[model samples]
Target chain A: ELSFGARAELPRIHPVASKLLRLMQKKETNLCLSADVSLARELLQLADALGPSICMLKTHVDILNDFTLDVMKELITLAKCHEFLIFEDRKFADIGNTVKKQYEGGIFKIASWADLVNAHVVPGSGVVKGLQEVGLPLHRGCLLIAEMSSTGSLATGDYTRAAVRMAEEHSEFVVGFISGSRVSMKPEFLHLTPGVQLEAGGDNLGQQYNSPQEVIGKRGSDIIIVGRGIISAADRLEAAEMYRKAAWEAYLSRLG
Target chain B: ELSFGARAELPRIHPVASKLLRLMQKKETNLCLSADVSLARELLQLADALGPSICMLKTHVDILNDFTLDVMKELITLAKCHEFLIFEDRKFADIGNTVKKQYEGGIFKIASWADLVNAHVVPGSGVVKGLQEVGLPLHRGCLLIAEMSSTGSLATGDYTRAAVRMAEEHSEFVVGFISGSRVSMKPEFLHLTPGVQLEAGGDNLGQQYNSPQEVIGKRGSDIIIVGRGIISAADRLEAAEMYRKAAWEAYLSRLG
Candidate 1:
């Protein structure tokens, strides 16, 4: 029932996400590295080293103790040099006015640097409306959370269905979704999934992990996002390379 | 009918929020000034000058262009000197794992100084669960978004009721809600309303403003939050005092 095809053949997806998907196809990689470290230096260092293996770098900017506008500038420069997009995992869920302020004015100024940002559709269309106003000028895109991979999460059943409907309705501003399960409704929007790991199992904090084969091969996700699976590896770049290869092969096998 | 009484009498509320409410009673002020400025120095300056006339100082911490952990330290010092609680208006709406990292690990480390913070119930109970896990150890509390004051906001009807249900279900961690209308069910959680201004007008954006009497007097809001109306005023401290007196008087009249 799931229709996986060449991304460009899809319709109704945002042009920004469409372009990124095409780029990923060209790069022959389906990996989006979650650069989840506590310092900007280490984060950018990892991005620099792993840039070749990924089409995008996802960041939790708040955790960077060394966060500064200059740090973002540096990352932006590296992203350009390495040819990867920047995704700020901000998960904004406020009213229009406050979300705009948070996205555009903060010291980190996420809207100014990030190519794509993610937010929860909890506050509804206003969140997308606010981001679209800010994003339209910048040509930025937003990813909505449909389902989470954690145990005891409430983002399932009707919750995810409503989220998908919102994303489908706001296709202009919405580029994709972050869901653990396969989405059949809006195949146009790129599906970036998390909880990807090389090994089997989950953390004590309730996060469940799935291997590249399980996700891309069976779950039918477009991109694989790996965090500690690579960040905590003995050799980060090598680990990143390993995941990139596994993910790319899995992506190809799914397409076949 | 809403039984408006002293916050200490509200045993269901968190100790932190209850302490803040008691402080508001002592100060004879229930105004929460939204310091939406772009610099740390200016924001702290306003907080320092106007802290006495308000129960809490609400902040969009990410917006401060010069934001640093040291700024939070100085603001904490000012709060101690002038007597008001710190409310970080961060509407966190992510899955539990990421939300925990955002709340506790960020360079801001919101859990460190923020007596109270807020989040969106959009991600279901997981958003609250993540915030609660991080906050329980630190004795921090979260406010949920029940409704918004924007024109085309989707956070109304059944959506808002569902949000309130989540808050009531997680009373141990939820202290209140950022709401537009009064909630009848679990009246224990305080309702803080925004879009409050001196005159009847809305910003060019979707934010529709209501007067203190319209909200606190008629709409059953416990706290009146004013942003540009005060922060952008010529004399911010004097303006804060004006709102404080108006909001407090309106609250008393409502109780009567």
Candidate 2:
């Protein structure tokens, strides 16, 4: 049935991954909001307004100019109250030992709070091993950046294939991928696609966007990460609802 | 002579790149100290002790548990007094629009302080373009991470070649590379190799180390980046001096 429940029941899936899958099914939403705002107040405001429409709230903690322990505590409280998970889009890329320090010892202390995180495979599988050591013990899951949705990206066919192989080898720690589409047909791995908007187009920069229907119904992505589409809108709460409705409908259409 | 001065005078080289080259030649050292400490006090102390022996002080600001504006100002002052540039090893790998916010708007405000920064080319030429837009106006330089020294890296031969092409296109912004060896024979781009030590060996992790002789004399890199080899030593200042001497001798040998 290709339901989130079916995916959650897959053998040996990371606990965080299973939790996210069940949450998506229970909420009947597959939108992952990329809250790329810069101020702590703006971040909390967006989370408060739009949390009901998202299965996951993606954050860039380093971007917040006034981020503090209190801000993080409130964000966690909001997530717990709203029944959504927090995903820090760290995109960690470093050697094993160094990345271990970055993941666990940093001021952000991503492994301590973030339910899920992502990393680039450019530094190799060691980066995963390093993150696994820190995140696995806490039941956190990782998503390997297999492909990017930008123009002229170097994440080519070979690089994506290598990412899949790496994810397969570290399936217990790595639960999915940040890719343009499904890089693998495996049910155990989830595909979370970014660069999605209500309409298909691109920015002045090289971010190419596809509609929610394209990303979910046609491209077969499990989740859609929409940033400017919702965050930049005049009414963010309404925007989030629209995107959530569109994406969920696409998923149901695909299921049929 | 194949000297830093000669490299500085290369046509269309970035101002920061030229400044670093001239500084290295004037100081007679080619060591980039990777200060991977976690405390603000520890970072400033290391910079004060070992700044004179290094041309660049590489930092991971996010790793600092007690980072403050005062810490950054003191570090910058130390760099000025000791004549070394600051390189923030952020390893940005995101879309153009996102990275622009990260480079310019974050709490660290990397483009505003760090004289140089490095990034992964996983997101393609757009990433370099994004960084260039922020850094070029500020007279800052970028280092493309063409390769890493960790085991099983996905930065394949084709990937490195693509990085070179990307660097060449954005030569004004991209001053050099972070690689294990010289990916390009072109002297226009300086290669700063990491994972180096006084002796050739690796840790329990995947970081593969090589001596200055192998990286500079045999592989044709312009600089060597040493982290724990110097910072973790019983006497950091002495360790830095030894590395500086060894790397300089290797450079001179390569010149001959």
Candidate 3:
């Protein structure tokens, strides 16, 4: 779910979550959608339209301004029908009390609805154990961040290593890896990627991107992601198809 | 992303992210959406519809078996339109090289998208520096796992204090972090907590939850995250609204 490795009997999706996942796979190998837009509602419609082509859908929840239950319901229904996963890029932090509030205090009932959730385990504390005792009882998988994406990210390897160790102990579902430039691959973590634009490479803001080939071939990526590339593509279907081809080809070329 | 207690010079989100934050705030504070659902797509929809009230959305990315772009576009679009923030829930733990791949090579291009990503600073690699070197830019907030909610959670005040020191060193790269247990109370971090459940109390699950009033009154959490109490509720809307009210009341009561 996050990075290159880890397999506990071929992780299965929660029944409900499978809906969105299935949709993406059904539509195509990849997906396309716009990022910087004015109306989130419109963006959601576009995202829903592309659900058939995507494998994963990532989001920055803080960007939306006007929201409603009907809108939320439609999205959920789409996931159910399409089989794609909706990712909340909250990047969770804080104490257990705060964490609890963030997850449970809402009409949607995130704890009851979210396919999975994320949290961190501080030093000395086995994060896994924390999940066991303090986290939701549901079988959602945890994706240990492990590292950053670009050149100037986290300096320590122990944190990621320790986190990985704990994740294993806690039986985390996946581990996120950000090693695009390096050959050090995560044998057990489900490899995920960011900073993956085509010509622009990296965003002027902070994100640095790469080609789907670079992401899959050189980086040994399981999934190739693009933000502006696919989102801004002239033809959503065409763009999604191109990415799907590139991603499939890369995996087949390397793994096969 | 990890914690909410870490403070700064008036933290602010970009216009795009700001919209999403609004939605998350609504959901978190109004609907009380806990992190318990079986699908991320459904959760995303709920967050999109109810996020405006929430302060954070905790997630577990591992169980996203069917992750794809179609759903991602939907989720992202909804989040963008609704104004909600995301918490990666990825307790990051890995070397710099690997983290890059995790961020760049997945269907979810976190480096290119996620505003906040969760990580664990337990590897003892000067937490903040390691992340920065790996590519933690200013725009992206890093929520370090500094503590846990479980009783046996390892990170003590000393560990958190040291982590705080490191966090302060790179506050620019850091957003917030998470910790464990009922803390002594501090206003220097943006903390996101979990392990929240209904007054139904603990069972064999071993997870102990508290009331929003208790957390706000004694937990010293800046932003509360939840998973059970809301999602598991018989009435999602009622539970969500209650939690939202609780959090809002708690936050407001702090002033009283």
Candidate 4:
């Protein structure tokens, strides 16, 4: 069902992904922040406050139960005005039939709304069809979750290689995995790793487990996904700047 | 409680949802079209064709599906021109903990994506708090699943009313209107009536049948939702117009 041959053109990689990547490669890239604010109004304040350094602003659309048509337009305009990439973290992992239902069904018209989607390929599903369907306008990107940024994560067998193949089938430009260095052999992989934070403290909730520098420096992740890093901080702007600095420093150190 | 005082002092409601609601109240609401496309180009075609009378250009964001952003944008633009409401059907469901983690975690940056969102509310979940954290700009439209909607529907009783009450407690809007009847209800219980299909055949799929006139006129549903009737119609545009006229007629008859 995937038009792999004639329609198999590589998707244009996101400029923010590249921009932040390059910034990190040089000196230290500024700290980026990720948080799930439930409203569009608060996000504007947060985004503007942390605009200078924050590279991306992600969201879970549903909890914001009060959204309207006009409000959404303003959200996009604000994101663009503030100079940030909007990421819709929808880890779509399902078979072709269910995924299609999830895709086309009127939940949140995802294909038209998200700039990028975090898809975890559940094997035997038509990853190509799923990817190709959402890859229109060539502006959207897919961040495949080949591996999670957690300790004692088991990927069993040739999981990394198979994940790579699946990621490729699902998305040409993928979230690279230095997180799976042992499993993944491909050097040039596009990755966006989350579960990062400045504090060594573990989530009492057992969710994210990360460090800014370690995730970016040691691991070859193109983008270090950080949630609650600078987000929950009291001084969001200051927190963002520090994280940005740490991320960039790690990225540049990777070169050495 | 809800920011009822603050919202009451607000200036005005958005015309798309407002106007759609008004049309729905009148039962002369135009046929609704959910844009399920494989490409941006296809979206444009669907938008252009369905624009004149479509109450909404529903999107799945194009990233996780087989569509493109450009096409989605084009459809959005076209739908806007034709006075169509954009419904990004993002159904947000997750634990309160991982909720925010998923919201701002994806690439679509959904807090700023679509006009409305279809959300499922588990009883006692403080879903609104999560949505309120969404970045500023977009109005959050929450779709509270009040009743059993489809063939495998598990919901029972006046759950729609309970859901409506909960939606009113937090959200400013009412979600899908199922089993509509003439009741001078609360102002916020705006309903989008789906499963309104004319029984042309005995039914190949697991579909519950209802005539357009019956649902809108007798039930007193504000907005009419017809999935396959308009989408998989022999003549889509014609079928759409037919439904639109029926919706309008039914809406007027409701007032009488």
The DockQ values of the predictions, listed in order, are 0.47, 0.77, 0.07, 0.03
* lDDT of each candidate versus the true structure: 0.81, 0.87, 0.49, 0.52
Name model 2 segments beyond 4 Å from true.
Answer: none
lDDT of 4: 0.52
lDDT of 2 by residue, A59-168 (tens): 98877888776787888888887777898898888888878888887678888878889989988889998999998998888999998989887777889998899899
lDDT for position B148 in model 4: 28
Model 4 lDDT per residue over B109-187, tens place: 4555456655434312334335445522355455555542244232234434545655666544433333333222543
lDDT of 1 at A122: 61
For model 1 chain A, give the 10-residue run with minimal summed lDDT. A1-10
List, residue by residue over B105-208, the lDDT tens digit for candidate 1: 77779989898898876666777888889898888878888787776555666667777888888888888888886764565777888888988997655678
Off by over 4 Å in 4: A1-99, A103-256, B1-16, B22-28, B62-66, B96-105, B123-125, B173-184, B200-207
What fraction of the true interface does each of the listed models get right, in terms of native contacts kept? 0.53, 0.76, 0.06, 0.01
Judging by DockQ, tell me the better candidate of 1 and 4.
Answer: 1
Best-matching candidate per TM-score: 2
- Taken in order, the candidates have interface RMSDs of 2.6, 1.2, 10.4, 11.0
Off by over 4 Å in 3: A1-39, A121-139, A172-189, A232-237, B1-256
- Residue range with the least summed lDDT across 10 consecutive positions in model 2 chain B: B198-207
- At residue B256, give the lDDT of candidate 3: 53
Per-residue C-alpha lDDT of model 4 across residues A1-256, encoded as one tens digit per residue? 1111211222443443454344333323434456556666766677677666766666555444444435545656755676556666655543232344554333356545555566543222243344545454455666554565433222223434455676554435453332322233333345566677778764432244566676766665545556677767888788877788777667557645
The TM-scores that each candidate's chain B achieves against the reference are 0.95, 0.97, 0.78, 0.78
